[PDB]
Amino acid sequence: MEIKRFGRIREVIPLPPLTEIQVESYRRALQADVPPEKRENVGIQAAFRETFPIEEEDKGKGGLVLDFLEYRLGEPPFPQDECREKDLTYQAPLYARLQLIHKDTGLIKEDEVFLGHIPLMTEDGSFIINGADRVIVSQIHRSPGVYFTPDPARPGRYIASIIPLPKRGPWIDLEVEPNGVVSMKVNKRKFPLVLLLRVLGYDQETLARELGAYGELVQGLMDESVFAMRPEEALIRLFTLLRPGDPPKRDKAVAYVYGLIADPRRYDLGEAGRYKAEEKLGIRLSGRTLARFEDGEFKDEVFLPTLRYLFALTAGVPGHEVDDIDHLGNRRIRTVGELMTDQFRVGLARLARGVRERMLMGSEDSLTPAKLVNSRPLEAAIREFFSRSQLSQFKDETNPLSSLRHKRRISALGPGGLTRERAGFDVRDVHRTHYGRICPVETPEGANIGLITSLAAYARVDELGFIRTPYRRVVGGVVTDEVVYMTATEEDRYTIAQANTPLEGNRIAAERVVARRKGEPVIVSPEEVEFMDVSPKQVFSVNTNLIPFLEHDDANRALMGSNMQTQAVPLIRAQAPVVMTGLEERVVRDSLAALYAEEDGEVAKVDGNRIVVRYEDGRLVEYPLRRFYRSNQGTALDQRPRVVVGQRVRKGDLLADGPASENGFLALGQNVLVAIMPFDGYNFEDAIVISEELLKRDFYTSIHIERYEIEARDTKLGPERITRDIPHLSEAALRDLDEEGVVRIGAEVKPGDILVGRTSFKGESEPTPEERLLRSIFGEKARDVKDTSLRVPPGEGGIVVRTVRLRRGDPGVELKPGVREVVRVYVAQKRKLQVGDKLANRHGNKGVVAKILPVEDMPHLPDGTPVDVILNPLGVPSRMNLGQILETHLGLAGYFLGQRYISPIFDGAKEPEIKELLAQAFEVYFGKRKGEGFGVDKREVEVLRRAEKLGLVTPGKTPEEQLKELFLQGKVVLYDGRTGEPIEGPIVVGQMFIMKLYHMVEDKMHARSTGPYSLITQQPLGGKAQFGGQRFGEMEVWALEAYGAAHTLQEMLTLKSDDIEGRNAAYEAIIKGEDVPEPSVPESFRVLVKELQALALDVQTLDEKDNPVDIFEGLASKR
C-alpha cells in the first residue's frame, strides 16, 4: 500500500511533547533529580523555605531558629507493578536536613526525619495512588494582580480591585462617592485613601500636585485636612478604624502584614506579580509585594500607582485602561507541580504549627528530632490530595489516546477559590484569546460545558501558567520561520494574520489579505501584517486534530466526534483510517501505546512475551510486553510484536504495536465499505444496519476484563471460611471450583456460577427453633454455616485468566482491619459486535446497530462485493458535517486504488484532487470489467436512464463515459440483493472509518423483579446482584396523571415501591395467580404522619362523617 498527502503549507515546526504540561510541572514542582545547588527553587524547595525559618521569640523563653539546609528524597519503597498487584501507593521517601538553634550555647542538628511519602509520576505523566492509575487535571482562575472594573448598579464610574491570593490576605477596592466619602476596603468596612498615603509619608501637597494636577480628583484627597496634619499618628488612627478594641500601641506590627511577608505574596520576585504591574500600571516594586521592615517607616510603590491609574483611567487617554478579565493574560493555568506544592506547603504549615508547641514542651536542649517533628500532618495532607482531591481522578484509559487527553485537560472547578459552580456563561464561552491556547471544540457536551477543557496543539505553559500561543514574526512583507510564544495581553498590540495567506516563502502574495487585530476580523495589507499564525493545528486540541476534514463539519457535531474517540475501545483487530489527518502517528508515539526502539541494532528474540533487541553498541535489552493487562475501564492492553527475528532496527521504530495500533498508527475501530442510503426502518432516526459479514470476520470484536473480589471477614459469630464447601446442594456447581475454594483458571463462568466459595454463620446470635426441627428430620448434623459465596453477577462473565489470594502471613501488603484475607478473580470475555452496540465515525455520526443483515440480501455492488454498513442519509443534512461524505468519497478511491491517504486539517485534500483519484479508481473498477469479458447491465443502463432524467449524467454520452461521470460524483449503481434489481438512482459508497463505543455499566440492561429495600426509606434498592428499581419521577407521574391511569399510578406508589404490606401480598398474590391485592397504606405516608407527630402537630385521618379511620393498622392503639 502507498501514501499520498495533499495539502501544502510548510509545517515549520514539529508538535511539542504532548504531556509536557504534566511532566514538566512535576519536574519544577519537585526539583529532586538535581542537587540543592541547582537554582530552580520553586515548588517543594520554595514551600519549604517559605515555612521553615520558624521564629518563636517571647512568651516565657524562646529565640527559636529551626533552619532548612537541603531537601533530599531518593529511594522508592516499592516498585510500580508491585504497587498495582498489591494495593500500594507509589511514593518517594523525603527527609530534608534540619538544625534547630538555641539562645544558650548549642545547636543540635538532627539530620533526617522522614515525614511525608509523596507520590511520583510515571514516565507517561500519570500516577499510581491506590491500585488505579490517577491523573491531576489542571485548573483556571483570576491571576493575582490588580484590575479596574465598571461599578455595579450606578452607570457612573468604575472601581479598582487589588487581588492577593492565598485566601488569607486582604482584597482591596477603590471607589469614590463624592458627596463626602471615598471607599477603600480590605476585609469590608471602608476608610480614606489618603489616611494611608499619609501613614506611608505622602503629604497632601506633594501628593495632590504631582499625582493629580492633571487630575482634579485630587481635591477629594486633601479634603479631611484635620487628620492629614499628623503623620505617624495616622498609623495609630487607622489601627483605631479597624475594629476589636485593640491597644493603640503596636509600633509596626499590623503594617508589616500588609507589608512584606505573608498576605502579599512570595510568588517569584520579578515576574510573578511585577509583570501585571509595569505594563498594566505603575512602574516599580521594591520587595516582591508592597514590602519593607528596615526602618519602621514603610515604602509603598504600589498604593499610589493604583490611584494614579484610577485618576488616569477616569480622565482620558494615558492609554485606554479597560481590562477585559477573560483576556488570557489575566487567566493563569495551574500545572501539576503547583497543585502539589500547595498541598505540600499547607502541610508544612500544619507541621510548623505543632512544632511551635513543642519548642515550649521539650525540657532542655535535646529537642531536635522528635521534639520538633511529627510526620502525621504532612502524611494526611499530601495523601488526602492524591486520593481525595476533586481534581485528581481515575486515569481514563479506555484506549491510550483517551488517557493522554485526561492527562492534559484543564478544569475550572476546584480549590474553590478560583471558579465554583455559580458563575458560568461568561467563562463558558470561547473567549477571543482562546486561540491556539484552548480548543473551541474539545469541551464536554453537558451542564459542565466550556469549564472543563483540554488544551491545544502547540499550546504551552511558559514560566507562569499563561497559555501562550505561537505566532511567527513577519517583518514587512516578509514572513519568518521564527516564532514568539506570546501572552494573551501582548497578542492584542499587534496585527496578526492567518496561515491560509498565499505564501511564496517569505513573501505574502495578496494585497488584500485577512488579519485580526484584537478579536476583530480585519482585512489588512501585506505591509501591516506584523505577525502570522503558526498552524491550522495549533488552533485545536490533539483529540480534535485527528478529524479528517474538520473544515467541512459543523463545530457543533465535531465535538461529538472528538469526545467519541475518547470512548473508542481497542479491537483485537486494529486498523488505521483510510484517510487520516496527520497526527495518528504522533498520538500513539507521544501516548505510550507502542514500544519504540531506543537506538539502532538487530533483533535477538521475538517472543509473544518479549523482544530482546541487540543494539549496535554491543548491548542487548529485553523488552517485556504487557501481554494482557486490565485497563481501569476494562479494555485490553496488549503489545503485539511487529518485528521478525534478526532485524536491523532504525532508532525509534515500532517493535510492538500498542493496544489499538495497526502499524505505529492510531487505530480504533475499522475501515469498512459503506453504502449511504435508507433501508427499511433499520436506519431511521439514528440507527445503523450492519452486514453479518462483519461478524464472520472477527472485525468488530473487543476483549473485556472485570475484576470480581471477595473477602473473608471476621465475624464474632465465627470466621468466614473460604473453602470448596458449599453447604446445601450440588457438586455440579463445584466443578470449576477445582482448587479448594478458588475457581480454576480458564474456566468458562456463566451468570450464576460460584467464582469463589465462603462460609459465614447463620443467625445474628441465636440458632433457629423451626430450622432446628428440619435439619434433625433429614440430617440433624448439618453444617450451620451460610453460603456467602462470590457468584457471577447477572450480565456476563468469560473465562478466568488470573486469580490472587492474600492469606495470613502478608508479604508486604496492606490488609484492612477485620479483613482476614482477600481473593481477586480476573475474568476476560470476547465481545463480538451486536445489535445493542453503538458505533460512530470521527465526525459525529453516532448511532446504534439495529439489524445485522445476512450478506445474502444486503446492497451489493455490480461485482459481487457487498456493503458492510448502510448509513441513513437523513442524519447528514440537519447535522452539518459533510466531512463524512467527503471521507467516504476519498475512501471509494482508496478501495480500488488500494491506498490510504493523509488529508490535513484545513490544508488537506481538495474536491478536484479527489475527483482525480476517483478517475483512477474507475479504471481499476471498470477497466478490469472490460478485460474480464463483460460490459453493461440492463440494470446498469436502467439506472442511467433515471440518472440523466435526474441530472447527474450528461445526456447523450456513452454508458461507459456516463458511469465515469457518475463515479467521479462518488456514487455508483447498486443492486438490491434481496431482489437483484437495481436501486433506482446512483448511491454513494466507500471506505469510512468507524469505531465502536465502550459499553458503560448502565448498558448492562437492568431488569428487576423483586429485591432489596432501603432501611429508613422503604423504596427498592439494588447494588451487587439485584438490579435495583427504576425511578418514577414527577414528570412521569403526571404522564400517568394525564392518562386515566388511576390504578397504574396507585400501583407505582403502593404495590411497587412503598406499600410494605402491599408488595408482600402482591407477590404472593401473583404467585398463586390471584389478582394483586388492593394497596394498603404506603410507608411514605406513615413515615410522614409520625415525622409530623415528632413535632407537636397531630395528623389524624377522618371518615365519611368527621370521625377517625386507621392508617397504622393496629400498632398505634396502646399496650
Method: X-ray
Domain spanning 593-667: CATH 2.40.50.100 = yes
Residue 18's identity, in one-letter code, is L
d(CA 672, CA 669): 9
> Are 538 and 553 in contact, with CB atoms under 8 Å apart?
no
Beta bridge partners of 132: 130
| Structure-block grid coordinates of residue 380 | 494526611
Give exposure, 736-760, as e/b (b: 16+ Cβ within 10 Å): bbeeebbbeeebebeeebbbbbbbb
| Radius of gyration, CA atoms only, the chain | 37
Closest to 865 measured CA to CA, from 672, 677, 994, 698: 672
Cell 483519484, located at residue: 917
User: What is the DSSP secondary-structure string of 690-712?
Assistant: EETHHHHTT-SEEEEEEEEEEEE
Domain ranges in the chain are 2-8+668-698+832-1004, 9-143+324-470+536-592, 144-323, 471-535, 593-667, 699-831, 1005-1115
d(CA 432, CA 704): 43
Cell 544558650, located at residue: 104
d(CA 611, CA 649): 12
CA 1049, 1051, 1053, 1054 torsion-angle sign: positive
Closest to 587 measured CA to CA, from 545, 639, 638: 545
d(CA 1099, CA 618): 91
Cell 426509606, located at residue: 1017
Give exposure, 1027-1044, as e/b (b: 16+ Cβ within 10 Å): bebeebeeeeeeebeeee
Q: Specify burial of residue 434 (Cβ count, 10 A radius: 0-12, 13-18, 19+).
A: buried
Residues 6+ apart with CB under 8 A from 82: 88
Cell 486561540, located at residue: 435
Q: Phi, psi at residue 205, to the nearest 5°?
A: -65, -55
Q: Is 450 left (phi over 0), alpha (psi -120 to 50) or beta?
A: left
| Structure-block grid coordinates of residue 89 | 501507593
What is 471-535's CATH topology?
Rna Polymerase Beta Subunit; Chain: C, domain 4 (2.30.150)
Q: Phi, psi at residue 879, to the nearest 5°?
A: -65, 160
Opening angle at CA 360, ends 359 and 365, nearest 5 = 65
Helix (H, G, I), strand (E, B) or coil at 880: coil
**Widest pairwise Cα distance in the chain:** 112
Give exposure, 24-41, as e/b (b: 16+ Cβ within 10 Å): bbbbbbbbbeeeeeeeee
**789: Cα within 13 Å, side-chain hemisphere:** 27
Closest to 593 measured CA to CA, from 627, 639, 624, 631: 639
Q: Specify burial of residue 401 (Cβ count, 10 A radius: 0-12, 13-18, 19+).
A: buried
Question: At how many Å resolution was this determined?
Answer: 2.4
d(CA 782, CA 765): 18
User: What is the DSSP secondary-structure string of 888-946?
Assistant: HHHHHHHHHHTEEEE--TTTS--HHHHHHHHHHHHIIIIIHHHHTT----HHHHHHHHH
Residues 6+ apart with CB under 8 A from 914: 886, 889, 890, 893
User: What is the DSSP secondary-structure string of 87-131?
Assistant: T---EEEB---EEE--SSS--B--------EEE---TTS-EEEES
Write a three-state SS string for 989-1056: EEEEEEEEECCCCCCCCCCCCCCCECCCCCCECCCCCCCCCCCCCHHHHHHHHHCCCCHHHHHHHCCC
Within 10 Å of residue 647's Cβ, how many Cβ atoms?
A: 14
d(CA 805, CA 823): 5
Q: Which one is the CATH code of 2-8+668-698+832-1004: 3.40.190.10, 2.40.270.10, 1.10.1740.10, 1.10.3660.10?
A: 2.40.270.10
Domains 593-667 and 699-831 share a fold: yes
| Structure-block grid coordinates of residue 1068 | 404472593
| Structure-block grid coordinates of residue 117 | 511519602
d(CA 959, CA 966): 10
CA 982, 988, 994, 997 torsion-angle sign: negative
Give the relative orientation of helices 376-387 and 336-361 as an angle to the nearest 10 degrees. 160
Strands 899-902 and 579-580, bridge-based pairing: parallel
Beta bridge partners of 612: 605, 622
Residues 6+ apart with CB under 8 A from 603: 611, 612, 613, 614, 643, 644, 645, 646, 647, 649, 655
Return the beta strands (E) in 634-700 as ranges. 636-637, 640-641, 654-657, 670-675, 687-691
Helix (H, G, I), strand (E, B) or coil at 216: coil
d(CA 913, CA 1031): 55
Q: What is the CATH number of domain 9-143+324-470+536-592?
A: 3.90.1100.10
d(CA 188, CA 173): 10
Q: What is the CATH number of domain 699-831?
A: 2.40.50.150
> Are 669 and 995 in contact, with CB atoms under 8 Å apart?
yes
What is 144-323's CATH topology?
3.90.1110
d(CA 25, CA 339): 9
Give exposure, 115-141, as e/b (b: 16+ Cβ within 10 Å): bbbbbebbebbbbbbbebbbbbbbbbb
> Are 875 and 686 in contact, with CB atoms under 8 Å apart?
yes
Give exposure, 261-292, as e/b (b: 16+ Cβ within 10 Å): eebbbbbbeeebbbbbbeebbbeebebbbbbb
> Are 165 and 301 in contact, with CB atoms under 8 Å apart?
no
Q: Phi, psi at residue 121, to the nearest 5°?
A: -100, 145
Q: What is the dihedral of CA 432, 438, 444, 449, to 10 degrees?
A: -40
Q: Specify burial of residue 7 (Cβ count, 10 A radius: 0-12, 13-18, 19+).
A: middle
Helix (H, G, I), strand (E, B) or coil at 651: coil
d(CA 220, CA 786): 86
> Are 516 and 528 in contact, with CB atoms under 8 Å apart?
no
| Structure-block grid coordinates of residue 648 | 536491523
> Are 696 and 760 in contact, with CB atoms under 8 Å apart?
no
Beta bridge partners of 8: none
Cell 506579580, located at residue: 273
Strands 127-130 and 132-136, bridge-based pairing: antiparallel
d(CA 691, CA 693): 5
d(CA 637, CA 124): 15
Looking at residue 748, the DSSP 8-state letter turns out to be B
Q: Specify burial of residue 1073 (Cβ count, 10 A radius: 0-12, 13-18, 19+).
A: exposed
Residues 6+ apart with CB under 8 A from 195: 224, 227, 228, 234, 237, 238, 241
> Are 36 and 54 in contact, with CB atoms under 8 Å apart?
no
Peptide bond into 502 cis (omega under 30): no
Write a three-state SS string for 1062-1100: HHHHHHHHHHCCCCCCCCCCCHHHHHHHHHHHCCCCCCC
